[PDB]
Ligand binder design. Structure first.
Ligand code: HEM
Ligand code: HEM
Ligand SMILES: O[C@@H](c1cn(-c2ccc3[nH]ccc3c2)nn1)c1c(C2CC2)sc2cncn12
Ligand SMILES: O[C@@H](c1cn(-c2ccc3[nH]ccc3c2)nn1)c1c(C2CC2)sc2cncn12
Lengths: 372, 385
């Protein structure tokens, strides 16, 4: 089994298991702002409340779960401060009373000082009833940006698909041990088990229609997910007052920072990060925005022999069929995702085109990996 | 690799799966000089680039080739030689005499097998540091040692291009630095086991290897001349990523639809220098252009060597360990490694002034800033000035 040092959970996988809901009393001033973003943004009192804060030390965040909650809290406040109401007026400087401890905590956790997928998706959740299962009805997010932003639906549906895909992670050690031991039948059962997990993850995906609406996603949520890397609104980046002299550019929160999807492309030999193209460059850059243990996990998978090369080298139709079942399940997920992105991004934009090409290039690379 | 999946990142030994040699390190040990007779048509062109470019017959000889299958390259060394052969021909075809006329399309009879072999080896279809430096060499006498006098390159671009000097001197510095690679497992085991004296001897041994590598560097003056390097060799090292001569990249006829952009051969693709920055916690790859360039150049390294660098990043921080000890001796040994890197990079800046900066001014920079930023990042990693 996968070492504890990789921080992969048996149940939720790359998601943070049982995230912390509240910070120690020393940080109640941060917690008040973060828990009241919809009202403080709408009223215009948010930027003032941030500017009125006293610079706190990160020294009172003892455990990893408190450090991860503080990252989500500070990250949500930073996005809200920079974008405000999201109708034009951008703040180009992050005050030192928040930027200093944000960059300090970010340096400790080896993550950039910007809200990432690991903050608003992997750590932004809770069970309503701990005795009930991990289903949409029994879950909620810790923070939202605005009322009606569909943040709960967007984040929880991504999280539920992450957990659905995570069921195949435990099969990875079996795949590599079966190749080493030359256990052909074991590798076939293992590849077929991974395919069924990825097929089950596509069924989970269907919930996106019931908890997100195109208008709220396109006109509201999108604003707060935006970063400052190649953005004309902050052409040189953001100033992290009292930490850096020059403004630093960081990419916004992306599902391209999800370790589960990157790990199945690595596992199946789908060279998503190879080729020198924009899609490959983006996905490689997004690894720097993943928790360090999860970034280490992906590299360890790349250090292991190629499952695709092994299957190609065997002249075994059954083994090729099992390998192709995994690849087909990934093409199916990415093809369904493209239809969702057409409904939620492409069509609302007409009532953008680059995101379609990025997803189509990623999907095409997966399709071209089929042995047949 | 399976053990690291079950017990976590731990580099107690350098596995053979990383393709690092005990003697030449990241360089390809004993590279193949000749391809099977099936590829003599490629070999003729590659071995005669100076004469074929100068005569004007080169582009014609490439266009006259029949598309050969990569199926007759069985071993890894033949595949690496074919990459160097095809890569050298591609650079010569694209640039020609290098005085204006560029070819924006690579013919399919060469581009198809080049991209096929490149896809197998997980490297881009452009000449990389691993081709013209790590695989472009041979021992004149196998019984004599790895010294400049007993070595030669397999391919050159033009007569008097100083390719032998530029490539072999880079290679000899690579091998000099490689002697410290075997000390890496000792460093990680000493930190795990809390063996303070062992870690001190290990850090001092790495420093002496990096100090010996600066002495090796001095040979650059005797085998390279500024005029030949600036007016000739530079042309053939140029790539097609952000180049105004091939603004959209190169067309790899019969392999890709759109023209693909790839960066030219760079010493920023050297795994030995990147691995000592990773080992010493010099965050060379951590938002600026210099950091982005060095991270991108990892995609141009052999896959096993790219995996080696990420495995080093997965292991605990030697810098954090040394900082946390309040031990002047351990800090002095750590600083000896960092100082040896600052010394190398400072001597290199003087070489780049002599070979690039001054020749550029004697005619009717961004690379200076890149090197200065890399050197500054190394200097700022010193615990005590
Ligand atoms: C409202 C529905 C959704 C929309 C509009 C949407 C949109 C997008 C966009 C625009 C990208 C491109 C990267 C970027 O610009 O950040 C992307 C990438 C991606 N999305 Fe979604 N997404 C949706 C739902 C989901 C869900 C539920 C998941 C499940 C985890 C998911 C997983 C991914 C993955 C893994 C990528 C990276 C590329 C790939 O591996 O195919 N998406 N998505
Ligand atoms: C004729 C002498 C030399 C010149 C003019 C020269 C020039 C350059 C240039 C222009 C770069 C910037 C990157 C690029 O544009 O691709 C560079 C980087 C570099 N060069 Fe050289 N070089 C010389 C000799 C050497 C030798 C002998 C080595 C030994 C291995 C070496 C090692 C490096 C390294 C490691 C880098 C990456 C940046 C760094 O880590 O400091 N150079 N060089
Ligand atoms: O990649 C993120 C994203 C950016 N945009 C976006 C970016 C640019 C845009 N332009 C016009 C619409 C639009 C939407 N949507 N989603 C994302 C998530 C974030 C929590 C981190 S969760 C998820 C699942 N599939 C994608 N994502
Ligand atoms: O990075 C490569 C390079 C580019 N240029 C260059 C780049 C821009 C220029 N502008 C005017 C002259 C000129 C030369 N020199 N060297 C390089 C090597 C390549 C074989 C792989 S070997 C080596 C050691 N130090 C650097 N290098």
């Amino acid at each position: 089994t996968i070492s504890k040092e990789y921080h992969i959970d048996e149940e939720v996988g790359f998601a943070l298991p049982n995230p912390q809901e509240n910070l120690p009393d020393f940080y109640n001033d941060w917690m008040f702002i973060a828990k009241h973003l919809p009202d403080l943004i709408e009223s215009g009192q948010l930027r003032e409340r941030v500017e009125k804060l006293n610079m706190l030390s990160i020294d009172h965040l003892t455990d990893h779960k408190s450090q991860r909650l503080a990252r989500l809290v500070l990250g949500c406040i930073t996005m809200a401060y920079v974008w405000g109401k999201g109708h034009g007026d951008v703040r180009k400087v992050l005050p030192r009373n928040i930027a200093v401890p944000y960059c300090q905590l970010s340096k400790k956790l080896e993550l950039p000082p910007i809200l990432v997928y690991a903050d608003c998706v992997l750590a932004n959740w809770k069970k309503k009833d701990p005795n009930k299962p991990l289903t949409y009805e029994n879950m909620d997010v810790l923070f939202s940006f605005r009322d009606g932003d569909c943040s709960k639906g967007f984040f929880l549906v991504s999280l539920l698909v992450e957990i659905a895909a995570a069921s195949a992670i435990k099969v990875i050690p079996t795949v590599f041990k079966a190749m080493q031991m030359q256990e052909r039948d074991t590798l076939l059962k293992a590849l077929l088990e991974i395919a069924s997990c990825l097929e089950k993850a596509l069924q989970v995906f269907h919930q996106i229609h019931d908890h997100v609406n195109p208008k709220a996603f396109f006109s509201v949520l999108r604003i707060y997910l935006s970063g400052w890397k190649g953005n004309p609104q902050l052409s040189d980046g953001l100033v992290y007052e009292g930490f850096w002299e020059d403004p630093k550019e960081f990419a916004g929160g992306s599902a391209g920072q999800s370790s589960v999807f990157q790990c199945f492309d690595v596992l199946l030999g789908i060279q998503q990060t190879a080729g020198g193209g924009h899609a490959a460059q983006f996905l490689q850059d997004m690894r720097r925005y993943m928790p360090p243990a999860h970034r280490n996990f992906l590299c360890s998978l790349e250090s292991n022999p190629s499952v695709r090369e092994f299957v190609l080298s065997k002249g075994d139709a059954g083994l090729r069929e099992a390998y192709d079942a995994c690849v087909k399940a990934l093409v199916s997920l990415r093809s369904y995702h493209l239809q969702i992105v057409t409904k939620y991004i492409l069509i609302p934009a007409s009532q953008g085109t680059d995101l379609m090409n990025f997803l189509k290039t990623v999907r095409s690379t997966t399709e071209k990996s089929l042995l047949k």
